[PDB]
Amino acid sequence: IINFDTSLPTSHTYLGADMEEFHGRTLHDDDSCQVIPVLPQVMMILIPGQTLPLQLFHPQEVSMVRNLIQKDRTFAVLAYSNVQEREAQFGTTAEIYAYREEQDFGIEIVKVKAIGRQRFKVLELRTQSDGIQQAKVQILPECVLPSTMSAVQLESLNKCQIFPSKPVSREDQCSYKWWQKYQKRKFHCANLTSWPRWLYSLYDAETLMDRIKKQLREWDENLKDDSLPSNPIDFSYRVAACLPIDDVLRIQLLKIGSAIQRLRCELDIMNKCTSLCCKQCQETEITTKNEIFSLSLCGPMAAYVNPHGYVHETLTVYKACNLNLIGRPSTEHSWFPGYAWTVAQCKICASHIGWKFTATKKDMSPQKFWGLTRSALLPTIP
């Protein structure tokens, strides 16, 4: 990744440049009951901190979004266990931070960009006369737990609980001789209990984050320590968003209230090897986890909107196996500026898998990469 600004895909320039931006925050009280409108067409599982673009065509969602503009700009995204019967027990709250209306083709179109804020539980699925669903919502809490040694630590050792800063920045391998010192000094009060030091390390947020960072840097070598968030909750949400997993695993990760449990589950998910295969055939391999790399500031998987308002969750990979290419390169409505695209379908079952992006110039790096949609991929765990 050289001479390509990874900040470009995050701003979503293809949608527009003169969007109306609202700065603010509206956080609901914990364990509170609320009524929030539901978008009828979205079928995506939004993790807090993720960005969602939307194009709205029908008059009723236009009017509902217009009403939402001054009423706290909050709508609910429902995580459908099975999308056919529209039954959901959990969901997420999305806040609007960019919006704009157009009058092209003689009809009104509203473009919206939203970010996930909070999790909730579905109580009552009320339906209105105008086709917009109103949901009874209970706001789930974020559990912040103190250090495991806060209940046992000696007071005389409280001054030694603060460590000198992590040694001179390493770039690869990360020889520690420090994580050992950190384990020895932070959990020194472990001999006052029935459990050893490494068990308490298995429930430490910093160590889990370091392990996750090492495993992520194994696959993509261009990660920097400051690219990931320094807060356990934000880090866990970002990692859950970036993992190539199916819907049930994402729902299970969303059901967890504690960041430490989420980090442990994410490590367990990463440990088991996965290979991405075509969903229709289930017998042809498309790509492996080793070729997953991050061309965007928000990981190798993001949500984008096509010219007709349909949302694809695209995964950026280096090498794609067994994909047929049909069409000519075209730069219209490309989610990655400076790249064209050609549609790619499975060589066997001819189902739509994704696209192939080819750079227009010759000084761009990477010259070519493939973007595959999540809904056409299934994780194969041997």
Binding site: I326, G327, T342, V343, H352
Partner: peptide, 26 residues
């Protein structure tokens, strides 16, 4: 001109349009 809605431009042929149409549903 003629092209898909669940995917990118597919205007190679009139046949390709409806091929992609029943393909996308399946």
């Amino acid at each position: 001109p003629f092209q898909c809605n669940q995917c990118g431009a597919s205007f190679t042929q009139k046949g390709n349009l409806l091929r992609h149409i029943k393909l996308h549903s399946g």
